[PDB]
Structure formats: C-alpha cells, structure tokens
Design a protein around this ligand. Sequence first.
Ligand SMILES: *[C@@H]1O[C@H](CO)[C@@H](O)[C@H](O)[C@H]1NC(C)=O
Ligand SMILES: *[C@@H]1O[C@H](CO)[C@@H](O)[C@H](O)[C@H]1NC(C)=O
Ligand SMILES: *[C@@H]1O[C@H](CO)[C@@H](O)[C@H](O)[C@H]1NC(C)=O
Ligand SMILES: *[C@@H]1O[C@H](CO)[C@@H](O)[C@H](O)[C@H]1NC(C)=O
Ligand SMILES: [Cl-]
Ligand SMILES: [Cl-]
Ligand SMILES: [Zn+2]
Ligand SMILES: [Zn+2]
Ligand SMILES: [Zn+2]
Ligand SMILES: [Zn+2]
Ligand SMILES: [Zn+2]
Ligand SMILES: [Zn+2]
Ligand SMILES: [Zn+2]
Ligand SMILES: [Zn+2]
Lengths: 376, 376
Amino acid sequence: HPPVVLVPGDLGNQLEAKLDKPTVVHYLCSKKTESYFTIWLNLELLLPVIIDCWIDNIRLVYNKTSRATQFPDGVDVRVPGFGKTFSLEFLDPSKSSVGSYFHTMVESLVGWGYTRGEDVRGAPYDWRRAPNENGPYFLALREMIEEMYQLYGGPVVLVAHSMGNMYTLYFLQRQPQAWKDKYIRAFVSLGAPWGGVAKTLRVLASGDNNRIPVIGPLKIREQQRSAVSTSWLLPYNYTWSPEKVFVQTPTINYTLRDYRKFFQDIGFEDGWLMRQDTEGLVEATMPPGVQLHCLYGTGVPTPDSFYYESFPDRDPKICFGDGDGTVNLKSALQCQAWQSRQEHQVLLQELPGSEHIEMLANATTLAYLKRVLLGP
Amino acid sequence: HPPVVLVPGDLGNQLEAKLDKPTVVHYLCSKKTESYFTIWLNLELLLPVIIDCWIDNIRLVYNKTSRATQFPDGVDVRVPGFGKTFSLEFLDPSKSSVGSYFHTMVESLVGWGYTRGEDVRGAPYDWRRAPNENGPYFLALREMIEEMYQLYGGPVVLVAHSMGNMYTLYFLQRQPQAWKDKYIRAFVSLGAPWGGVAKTLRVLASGDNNRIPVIGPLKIREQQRSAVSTSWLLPYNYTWSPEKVFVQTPTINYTLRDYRKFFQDIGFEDGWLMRQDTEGLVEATMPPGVQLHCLYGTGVPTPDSFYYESFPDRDPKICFGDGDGTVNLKSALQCQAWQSRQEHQVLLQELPGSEHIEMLANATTLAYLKRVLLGP
Ligand SMILES: *[C@@H]1O[C@H](CO)[C@@H](O)[C@H](O)[C@H]1NC(C)=O
Ligand SMILES: *[C@@H]1O[C@H](CO)[C@@H](O)[C@H](O)[C@H]1NC(C)=O
Ligand SMILES: *[C@@H]1O[C@H](CO)[C@@H](O)[C@H](O)[C@H]1NC(C)=O
Ligand SMILES: *[C@@H]1O[C@H](CO)[C@@H](O)[C@H](O)[C@H]1NC(C)=O
Ligand SMILES: [Cl-]
Ligand SMILES: [Cl-]
Ligand SMILES: [Zn+2]
Ligand SMILES: [Zn+2]
Ligand SMILES: [Zn+2]
Ligand SMILES: [Zn+2]
Ligand SMILES: [Zn+2]
Ligand SMILES: [Zn+2]
Ligand SMILES: [Zn+2]
Ligand SMILES: [Zn+2]
C-alpha cells in the first residue's frame, strides 16, 4: 500500500504554547509557564473567568512593517506531532468524543496494514496562518514525502481535509512537475474550500463559535480576526459572482468587491492587509498536476449570505444554500475545471448529505479512500 | 484539448499540377493533362527518361520586373488538403514508407482525442516560395485559426517543423499582439533553421538529392535553384560569423558577405535577387510574442562548410559540425535570445541524437507535445 500523509484543516490539529509574557491583561492570567501547555483544544482554558487570558495567548499580532504576523510578546506557539498522528487523531489530549477528528480514518488505515508514524504520517501546521508564513512547514513536508518514498518503496498519497486542501494545493503548485511525477501518487481532497466560503464574512463581522460554543461570539471574534487564514478564505472572484451580496445591512451591501470598505466598517483594517497578503497565494487556474480525487458534500444547508439588523455586533439572520454546511457547492466546479488543464486523472465524487467535519469519519468516505490506497 | 495546426517544412506536403503548356522541352513530355496529377511526391515522374519533363513543370520562373516568381506558362500548381491532414501525413499518394511524414504525430493526436480536419488541421503551402509570395496562405491560416478558436473553445497550438518554423515566425511577427494573445496558446517549434543552414550553399552550387536519390544531383539543382525558399535559408549574419567560410575552392573562399559573387560564379544571378527579396522577411530580433517551445536536435553530424576540388559541378568534400544533420546547433541560440525580448515563456528542449526529419515521428518528441496539449 502507498505511503499516506494526512493534512488537516483549520482547528484540525493540536497547538501548544509556552509563556514568558512582559504583561498580562488580567491579574488572573499566567505570565510565565513551566513548560508548554495545550492551548488547543483545552476546554479548561475557555472558562469565562480566564477566557481573556486565552485570547491574549492564541491571537496573532499583525505587523504592517513586515507584512507578517507575530505571536504576542513572550508567547511561543508550536505544532506538536509532525510526522506522527496523535496531535491530529484527537484535538483534546483527554481525547473526548467532541475532539475526535482523524482517529476514525487513522484506525481504518492501521486496520488495512498501516503503522502510525511509519507509512502513515500527519502533517499538522499552525492553521492560524496562511501558507506564506509556513515556508518551513512546506520544506519539512517535502522532506517527509521524499523520506517516505525511499522507506516504503513508492510515491505518496496526500489526504487533505477542509483548509488543508488549500495548503496542499499551494504546496503542489509550487513544486516542480518532475518532483511531483516522482514522489506524489495521488491527491485525495476532502471538502476543499476552493475559492473561499461565504461564512468567512460572518466570522469576521460578529464571530462564529459553532465549533466551540463555550466561547462567546464576540470573544472568539478577537481570535478569528487575528488569524490570517480567516481572511485567506474570503470568497474569491473565480468562484463567486462579483455582484453577490454576502453581507446585507439596512444601509450597505457588501460584495467581494467591497472587502476594503467591509474591513473598515467593522473596525479591523488589518484584515484588508492580510487579504492583500493572501489573495494571490493559490494560483486561480493552475491544477495540482497529480492524480486528483475531489470528494465534496452536497445536500447540507450552507450559509451563503447574512442579514444584519444591528451590524456588526449582533448575530445575523443566515440565508442558506447548497453545500456541505461550510463549503458552498460551487467550489467543486473548480475541481472540474482542472480536467482540461492536466493529463493526470481528476475524479469528482459527490457525497450527498455529508457534512464538512463529519465526512472525515464517514464510512462512505473511508470506503472511497480504501479503493484509492488498496486498489480494486 | 486545445486546437492544433500543423505547419510542414520544405518538401513537407504534397503538390499537384495541371498542364496546358505552349511547348515542351522534349517530345516525350506531356503538354496538356486531363486533370491534376501529383507532382510531389510521385516517383513515377522522376525516371531518367522523363526527369526533364518534371523539372520543366516544378521549376519556378523568376521575373525581374515584378521581383516575384511565376509558374511556367500553362502550368498550374496547387496545394491540396489545406485544413486537412492527408497531404501532410504522407508525401506520396501511394503512402510509401519513405514518404511517411506527419502521420505518426497525427495518429498520436487522434489517439489523445483529436479528429483529423476538425480540432487538428494541416496548413500546407507551396514550400517552393518564401513568405512574401504566400500572402493568401497567411490570410487563410489566420481565418482557420479564428475558426478553430470559435468551434473548439480555446486558443490554438501551432506545431511547425523545419522551414515551417520560419513561415510561422513570419506569420506571428506580423499579427497584432492582441490577436495572438487571444487566438494563440503556444508555438511548438521542431527543428527550426533560425538564421539559415550551411548546406544551402551546397544545394545551390551543386545540388543535393539526399531526400530523393533517384534524381541526379545536377538535375535537381535546376529545381532547387529556382525555388526562392532555397536562397531564403542561406546563412544569416545574426547567427553565423561574417568570416565563416562556407564554400572553399582552390582559388576563392565564400563567406556570407560574398553571396552576390557566389551567385555570379555559379552562373545563377537570379538567386542573388531572390536573396534580396527574402533577406528581410523575418525580423532578426523580434520574438514570436507567444509561449514558445524550441525543440532542437544535437549530436547529429551536420555540414558546416564544403570544399570543392572542381567548383561547382562536382560533389564537394563535406566538413561536419554539431546539429540535427540539417540545422546547425547555433541556430538554437536565436531561440535563447528571445527570452529577454518577450513576456511569454520561452522553453528550450534539446533532443540529443534526433535527426532533422526523424524528430517528427520520434516518441520523445511526441511525449513532449503530449504534455503541452494535455497538461501535466
Ligand atoms: C515589526 O517588524 C519590524 C521589522 O522586523 C520590527 O522592527 C518591529 O519591531 C515589529 N513591530 C512590532 C510591534 O514588534
Ligand atoms: C456519510 O456519507 C454518506 C454519503 O454522503 C451519507 O449518505 C450519510 O448520510 C453520511 N453519514 C452520516 C452519519 O451522516
Ligand atoms: C514579368 O512581369 C511583368 C509585369 O507583371 C509582365 O509584364 C511580364 O510579362 C512578365 N515577364 C514574363 C516573362 O512573364
Ligand atoms: C528519438 O529522440 C530521442 C531523444 O532525442 C533520441 O535519444 C533517440 O535516439 C531518437 N530515436 C531515434 C530512432 O532516432
Ligand atoms: Cl493519473
Ligand atoms: Cl507563457
Ligand atoms: Zn473547513
Ligand atoms: Zn440572498
Ligand atoms: Zn436569502
Ligand atoms: Zn441566500
Ligand atoms: Zn528543414
Ligand atoms: Zn572549416
Ligand atoms: Zn573542416
Ligand atoms: Zn567545418
């Protein structure tokens, strides 16, 4: 069986932090820690009495001089488990039911003959950032793939979920074709947000605590705005219409042509700079150049626009379209466009009724993956 | 897949003729024919008893008043199969092994999904002339390209062999940039004689029957001198050195500065006029202005000069340099010069050991073409 590398989406692998901060926002917050602690996912840190401490540690500071993000002073954040699977099978070190992520898929692979950290390996990353600030991650990923090719006697299958598809596409578009032809067997794409997702507007405007409801919406908005990866997934012109209204107020309508004014009207102009930094990272029409399987969910009510009666501090009324609940269905059209652009096969597989996160543990998803890896 | 137009080199497509001649050079020659007959390639016409009849029909008459060529009186020559492929896949209507030309490439294209005369079409022409006398051909080529763009939903890839590269470069240099940006996807150049070939001197001086050995060398020289395209491919100053000696006699040495004296010393002053007519057709330093793939053969002994002990009626001693057997390797330098001169990519691809004619049917050549048309 071919070696496998797993690339998670946003919030899709653990993060750890160590503190030696010059100041704290509240006298209850720790200034300095003995060693690293799990900052995601750790329910203990999200209680209302100390939720402000967690925000001050997991947010990113944007630097206009360098056009890059920085951790807050004295805070280090590292990504554990690179080349392994534990930080990616469960999001909470206690391994709760809520935080079960890649575990079901990893367990299937091991059942088929794989060995964790050997011929199946995870490629976690700091999903708060866009690819332009994870240069070292992609170098590490290339070396891991070359290593796995040598050890297990064949090219590697890349399995990416959610935002990880955009990380993997960025990686593949920038490797030479001869390298991909030698080292990559296939690219299995699970719920890829090609061209952005409409819910990104709501995330920036008023926050979205859907995946971690213990955090108040205005508190998580502080962290979600500071993450470059949020603005990176704003809707793109090569998928959406420039006339499409994503945010509607009694006064103004915001299309994808109005991101500059949108960021100014929500009091977060740094978002516009991060959109500038990230809008051109993924080439609009360049295919990955490897055999591709695009698996996408349909039949799940998916937010396509938002109406605010009180903008932007009150939850909006959501208007729903088709998709997997997160990724709008029109994103799958991008996969179909790559057929004419590359020789390698591009297979599209609709998953009716399969939700964005739940497709990772779905038996139909795993059945498709099994045919790719083990053959007929 | 992108539409494809095939442009042949010299001798690279069939020619047909119809006769209503006022006189014949010999009483065995036909004066008037019922319909058109194949004049190239037709081995029946080349037997020694009637070889003079064929010369009198396929030669061109140069007219000093008009600075143009004319068919002999009462002879019409037409180019069959424009927009199709039959006149260009095989040079002999019997389809001999010798005359198989574009057939292998066309067969590959059809294997990849193309359809003869539909999204792959030939652009044959009267290769006896230089571009200044094929004005209507280039008009027909532009209309065919615009038609193919509309019918098949994309810009066209031009695939040219041998002299056809100079025809295609002449065409592209003279189309507006906005037109090429819309209608041309890429230009694949196979064995292009950028800047002339040294063997042209030998052709004019004493004839060269290498591609059709049944014709005596002094007889074919009559036809090759009368063809404007011969003088058009004399070595050019922007490739060769002005001090390079192409023809050596016990008395005189001929460089590219001596073409007028050369044409006088071989008793063919009309050639000097045809060189004047054609020396400025292709601009020396103007790039094609489209994405370009320059495929050139190396490692094949290529005539670079000639020594005559008896000038110019006896076969010379040949001195060999590097190239594809016909095109000297320094011609590929012209393609490398165009990188700095245009925005579109200029790719250079050496073909070690690939002969001028044989690269058209070579699997490595077709493999390169496949990636251009179908993508990675
Ligand atoms: C931003 O980066 C610049 C250049 O690295 C550095 O001088 C400056 O200290 C940084 N800004 C902050 C707030 O750290
Ligand atoms: C798993 O995916 C299949 C195919 O999309 C879908 O029919 C089924 O409802 C999903 N399973 C669950 C539990 O949603
Ligand atoms: C050459 O062209 C001139 C002008 O077109 C014409 O008058 C003359 O007849 C032509 N010469 C021959 C030999 O046909
Ligand atoms: C075909 O081209 C390849 C690459 O240039 C060359 O190595 C090989 O010798 C050629 N094949 C023949 C039959 O000449
Ligand atoms: Cl494939
Ligand atoms: Cl280009
Ligand atoms: Zn996602
Ligand atoms: Zn609407
Ligand atoms: Zn609506
Ligand atoms: Zn709607
Ligand atoms: Zn040639
Ligand atoms: Zn010499
Ligand atoms: Zn020599
Ligand atoms: Zn020499």
